[PDB]
Design a protein around this ligand. Structure first.
Ligand SMILES: *[C@@H]1O[C@H](CO)[C@@H](O[C@@H]2O[C@H](CO)[C@@H](O[C@@H]3O[C@H](CO[C@H]4O[C@H](CO)[C@@H](O)[C@H](O)[C@@H]4O[C@@H]4O[C@H](CO)[C@@H](O)[C@H](O)[C@H]4NC(C)=O)[C@@H](O)[C@H](O[C@H]4O[C@H](CO)[C@@H](O)[C@H](O)[C@@H]4O[C@@H]4O[C@H](CO)[C@@H](O[C@@H]5O[C@H](CO)[C@@H](O)[C@H](O)[C@@H]5O)[C@H](O)[C@H]4NC(C)=O)[C@@H]3O)[C@H](O)[C@H]2NC(C)=O)[C@H](O)[C@H]1NC(C)=O
Ligand SMILES: *[C@@H]1O[C@H](CO)[C@@H](O[C@@H]2O[C@H](CO)[C@@H](O[C@@H]3O[C@H](CO[C@H]4O[C@H](CO)[C@@H](O)[C@H](O)[C@@H]4O[C@@H]4O[C@H](CO)[C@@H](O)[C@H](O)[C@H]4NC(C)=O)[C@@H](O)[C@H](O[C@H]4O[C@H](CO)[C@@H](O)[C@H](O)[C@@H]4O[C@@H]4O[C@H](CO)[C@@H](O[C@H]5O[C@H](CO)[C@@H](O)[C@H](O)[C@@H]5O)[C@H](O)[C@H]4NC(C)=O)[C@@H]3O)[C@H](O)[C@H]2NC(C)=O)[C@H](O)[C@H]1NC(C)=O
Ligand SMILES: *[C@@H]1O[C@H](CO)[C@@H](O[C@@H]2O[C@H](CO)[C@@H](O[C@H]3O[C@H](CO[C@H]4O[C@H](CO)[C@@H](O)[C@H](O)[C@@H]4O)[C@@H](O)[C@H](O[C@@H]4O[C@H](CO)[C@@H](O)[C@H](O)[C@@H]4O)[C@@H]3O)[C@H](O)[C@H]2NC(C)=O)[C@H](O)[C@H]1NC(C)=O
Ligand SMILES: *[C@@H]1O[C@H](CO)[C@@H](O[C@@H]2O[C@H](CO)[C@@H](O)[C@H](O)[C@H]2NC(C)=O)[C@H](O)[C@H]1NC(C)=O
Length: 322
């Protein structure tokens, strides 16, 4: 007689027993694959005398895991919440992921691992270094600090901080490197020849202590009036007193700091150590005028050879430039 032929392969299903032909009266069973379900479940069929498998209503669809698109204080990456898909998690700034960063919809239609949670990153109160106080610190969570909170140390008087005064609460719930505070001392500074030095009346001199210098008349400082004890045990500078120069000529228009001046007028009480000036000289060939420089160095200034002071003719200073 007739036989039923090989049964149709339906999506996400298996047939048992699967043969290429069946005698009338034999049974087959469609089941959905693991991870899938159908309206009606298993369909059984018996090969009829006609050899025609009847019509199969079985539609197998993925198990759907419970909705997981919202992570408080974070983000979920997903397409669909159905077997066998994966979803990823990450947290907003200042939170850490408390749990696995991904989960799968199992053939049983639950999440594996369990869904995680975002929690606030926190550090405990930080430690004071030795010979330091805590200027800026107030807990922002209980008595703990939140991510990217800061604390600031100042050293004790006579102490230089090596490192940095500001620590930050890290992702790892620990703070950044603490700075060190050490006592630092400087020598007494030397009185300069032709000058004097003032510093405070005490036996040892410490970090951030100041000395001031001065000069006798006809002398001026070749560096700053004020110096301090640096963190490296020395001084900012050690200035000397140097001789002023007498005006090297009687009358001359010169450049001083980009601007023409009468050297007689500008330097009536002499020139200080370092005062630079430019005299005007004539190029007799091209009947035009150039400058050369001249500096007061410790009571000496060399007026250029090319310069000619005029005791009716024209001064270099009054001639067109070259
Ligand atoms: C807050 O809490 C946090 C939580 O733990 C703390 O975070 C930790 O920070 C510490 C370091 O302070 C971490 O430990 C250390 O890890 C160092 C780096 O390891 C990487 O390199 C290793 C190379 O062997 C390798 O094993 C790792 O795989 C790792 O690599 C990387 O992978 C990532 C991806 O995941 C990539 O993105 C990276 O690019 C990749 N990097 C590399 C290099 O591959 C490690 O070096 C360090 O070791 C020192 O201390 C050990 C103490 O026991 C000691 O045993 C070690 O020998 C080493 O020391 C030194 O030895 C090394 C050589 O091994 C010397 O280096 C060289 O010198 C050569 C000259 O001959 C030269 O040729 C080379 O170029 C090189 O310069 C080095 O000089 C030696 N130093 C000294 C002083 O002797 C240590 O294992 C820890 O893992 C972190 N944990 C976390 C969770 O982050 C944090 O510290 C806390 N903060 C505070 C403020 O307390
Ligand atoms: C910043 O962060 C800091 C650091 O954390 C934080 O400072 C902490 O501040 C808290 C509170 O300010 C301190 O806490 C606890 O204080 C207890 C005193 O009081 C209680 O009584 C008053 C009465 O008016 C009541 O109002 C309180 O709510 C509280 O009592 C409660 O009692 C009811 C009863 O009806 C219970 O239902 C509640 O559970 C209970 N509530 C609480 C919160 O406890 C003080 O006695 C406690 O001391 C504990 O825990 C300490 C942990 O370090 C531990 O050192 C102590 O030794 C003690 O633990 C005792 O442990 C014994 C065993 O080891 C146990 O022995 C017996 O009991 C059982 C029987 O079943 C057996 O073990 C045994 O057989 C034996 O019989 C004791 O019972 C047990 N004692 C208690 C009382 O449970 C708490 O400290 C913190 O101490 C303090 N921490 C530090 C480090 O300073 C600060 O608040 C934060 N700042 C800010 C702004 O948030
Ligand atoms: C108060 O205190 C201290 C003295 O106790 C003074 O600190 C000294 O300052 C100098 C320069 O300001 C520094 O030394 C050297 O720094 C530079 C750069 O150094 C880097 O590069 C070198 C490679 O050359 C490498 O090792 C490192 O990467 C390093 O970071 C150098 O160019 C220079 O190095 C040499 O100095 C030698 C003289 O000692 C010469 O022979 C060399 O030809 C070359 O110039 C420089 O000296 C240090 O920070 C420090 N030195 C020491 C010995 O402690 C500070 O200046 C002083 N201040 C005042 C205001 O008086
Ligand atoms: C101590 O070190 C910190 C960390 O490097 C410095 O902070 C940085 O400051 C600069 C300019 O102020 C910024 O561009 C950076 O973004 C800061 N980094 C961080 C992690 O905050 C700080 O300036 C240093 N303190 C001193 C006194 O030098």
């Amino acid at each position: 007689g007739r036989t039923c032929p090989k049964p149709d392969d339906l999506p996400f299903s298996t047939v048992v027993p699967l043969k290429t032909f069946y005698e009338p009266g034999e049974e087959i069973t469609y089941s959905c694959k693991p991870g899938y379900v159908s309206r009606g479940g298993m369909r059984k069929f018996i090969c009829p005398l006609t050899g025609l498998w009847p019509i199969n209503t079985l539609k197998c669809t993925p198990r759907v895991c419970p909705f997981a698109g919202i992570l408080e204080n974070g983000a979920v990456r997903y397409t669909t919440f159905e077997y066998p898909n994966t979803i990823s998690f990450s947290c907003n700034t200042g939170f850490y992921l408390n749990g696995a960063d991904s989960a799968k919809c199992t053939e049983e239609g639950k999440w594996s691992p369990e869904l995680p949670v975002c929690a606030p990153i926190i550090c405990p109160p930080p430690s004071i270094p030795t010979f330091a106080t805590l200027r800026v610190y107030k807990p922002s969570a209980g008595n703990n600090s939140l991510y990217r909170d800061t604390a600031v140390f100042e050293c004790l008087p006579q102490h230089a901080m090596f490192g940095n005064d500001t620590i930050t609460c890290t992702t790892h719930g620990n703070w950044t490197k603490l700075p060190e505070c050490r006592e630092v001392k400087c020598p007494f500074p030397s009185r300069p020849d032709n000058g004097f030095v003032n510093y405070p009346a005490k036996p040892t001199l410490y970090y951030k202590d100041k000395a001031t210098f001065g000069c006798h008349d006809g002398y001026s400082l070749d560096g700053p009036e004020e110096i301090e004890c640096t963190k490296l045990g020395n001084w900012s500078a050690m200035p000397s007193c140097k001789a002023s120069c007498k005006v090297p000529v009687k009358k001359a228009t010169v450049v001083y700091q980009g601007e023409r001046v009468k050297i007689q007028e500008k330097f009536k009480n002499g020139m200080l150590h370092g005062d630079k000036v430019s005299f005007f000289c004539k190029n007799k060939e091209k009947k035009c005028s150039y400058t050369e420089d001249a500096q007061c160095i410790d009571g000496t200034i060399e007026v250029p050879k090319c310069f000619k002071e005029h005791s009716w003719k024209t001064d270099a200073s009054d001639v067109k430039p070259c």
